[PDB]
Ligand binder design. Structure first.
Ligand SMILES: N[C@@H](CC(=O)O)C(=O)O
Length: 270
């Protein structure tokens, strides 16, 4: 009846802010979240946090929410998982929720809920920049061009895993252009230091919709990469999967998720 929940900041799905200075509490639509390093203070809000609030209410559990510091979403290195996936896999958390992408590798070792956000991989470029998309040889045969195209991703997640598995030559080229967070990637794109940023589609599309001046645009990967979704990670064989799935499927049909997309993921640019 009390669940430990791991999450990770990735705006606008999970947004972290200090407690209200005046009250010392998390006000508005925010909820208390602590750091993995530790153990109000910090407070979390956003699309995934609203999902979590509704699940807790509908299913009837209480929870302790914490932010992962041991890596990010989840990466397996030399036999060991880090990030949100590792927290669930090693049973430090009963579930993990955030912008967490379902893939085959992860699905082998944790159970996921049904997907509640559609995503995949997209490419973001400055509106001026002329490429056709991820099929462009500027991407696919990157060192065939005299001044080479500069393109990168934020490493360690499902995006990099997909590129390394399916397009190993392109992946090897991208390594020098790894970015530490989406915020720095966007900054490099705008400074011309990158020509393109390849990343999670749900996040990139949102960033395009919110770009001041609407100067950043995304191209869908088309057939280059498959579509997938965000899912809540749970212990393999978790008793929580079924009630969570039922709730999520209910939210979908009630237009509750659609409402939350409007609330959190809308922007001015189109
Ligand atoms: N949401 C993705 C982030 C990425 O593509 O790097 C993940 O769970 O790994």
């Amino acid at each position: 009846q009390h669940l430990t929940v791991a999450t990770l900041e990735e705006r606008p799905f999970v947004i972290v802010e200090p407690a209200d200075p005046i009250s010392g509490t998390c006000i508005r639509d925010s909820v208390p979240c602590r750091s993995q390093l530790n153990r109000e203070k910090r407070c979390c809000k956003g699309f995934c946090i609203d999902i979590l609030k509704r699940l807790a209410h509908t299913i009837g559990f209480s929870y302790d929410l914490y932010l992962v510091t041991n890596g990010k979403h989840g990466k397996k290195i030399d036999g060991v998982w880090n990030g949100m996936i590792g927290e669930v896999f090693y049973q430090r958390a009963d579930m993990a929720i955030g912008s967490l992408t379902i893939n085959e590798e992860r699905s082998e070792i944790v159970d996921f809920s049904v997907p509640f956000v559609e995503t995949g991989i997209s490419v973001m470029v400055a509106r001026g920049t002329t490429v056709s998309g991820l099929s462009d040889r500027k991407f696919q045969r990157p060192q065939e061009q005299y001044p080479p195209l500069k393109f990168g991703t934020v490493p360690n997640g499902s995006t990099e895993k997909n590129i390394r598995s399916n397009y190993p030559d392109m992946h090897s080229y991208m390594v020098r252009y790894n970015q530490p967070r989406v915020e720095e990637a966007l900054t490099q794109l705008k400074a011309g230091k990158l020509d393109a940023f390849i990343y999670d589609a749900a996040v990139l599309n949102y960033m395009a919709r919110k770009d001041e001046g609407c100067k950043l645009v995304t191209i869908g990967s088309g057939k280059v990469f498959a579509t997938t979704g965000y899912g809540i990670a749970l212990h393999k064989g978790s008793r929580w999967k079924r009630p969570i799935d039922l709730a999520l499927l209910q939210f979908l049909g009630d237009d509750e998720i659609e409402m939350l997309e409007r609330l959190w993921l809308s922007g001015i640019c189109h």
